[PDB]
């Protein structure tokens, strides 16, 4: 599914994320537009040989399992196939995860390279939440 800007920033908060470990809602959705232009079926490969999945490009190397990422964890605990749902539920809970590891949001490298300092309550300006 593709959602749109403030429909995927309601169901973020619904599902948890505004100001989860302090980032404010924007950061989500900013960091979810450079990852998968809001696509809940994006899927790119690493040059390493790992994926990313979903919304917000989450990492085979670590994160799911895709049964093809030599020499990986899957630290969410859950099929890497479960990150493209049209339900947002299981990326929500394992970027939850990857937030809290001690990182912050830089795990993101998109949220670094383009949200990180910026006017990311843009992103969310306009909508009913
Ligand atoms: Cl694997
Ligand atoms: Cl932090
Ligand atoms: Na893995």
Request: no cysteine.
């Given at each position: 599914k593709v959602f749109g800007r403030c429909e995927l920033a309601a169901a973020m908060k619904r599902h948890g994320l505004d100001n989860y470990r302090?980032?404010?809602?924007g950061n989500w959705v900013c960091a979810a537009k450079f990852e998968s232009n809001?696509?809940?079926?994006?899927?790119?490969?690493?040059?390493?040989?790992?994926?990313?999945?979903?919304?917000?490009?989450?990492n085979s190397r670590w994160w799911c399992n895709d049964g093809r990422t030599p020499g990986s964890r899957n630290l969410c605990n859950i099929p890497c196939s479960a990150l493209?749902?049209?339900?947002?539920?299981?990326?929500v809970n394992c970027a939850k995860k990857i937030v809290s590891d001690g990182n912050g949001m830089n795990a993101w490298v998109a949220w670094r390279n383009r949200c990180k300092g910026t006017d990311v309550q843009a992103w969310i300006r306009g909508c009913r939440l």
């Open positions: 302090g980032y404010s809602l809001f696509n809940t079926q994006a899927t790119n490969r690493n040059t390493d040989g790992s994926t990313d999945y979903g919304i917000l490009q989450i493209l749902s049209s339900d947002i539920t299981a990326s």
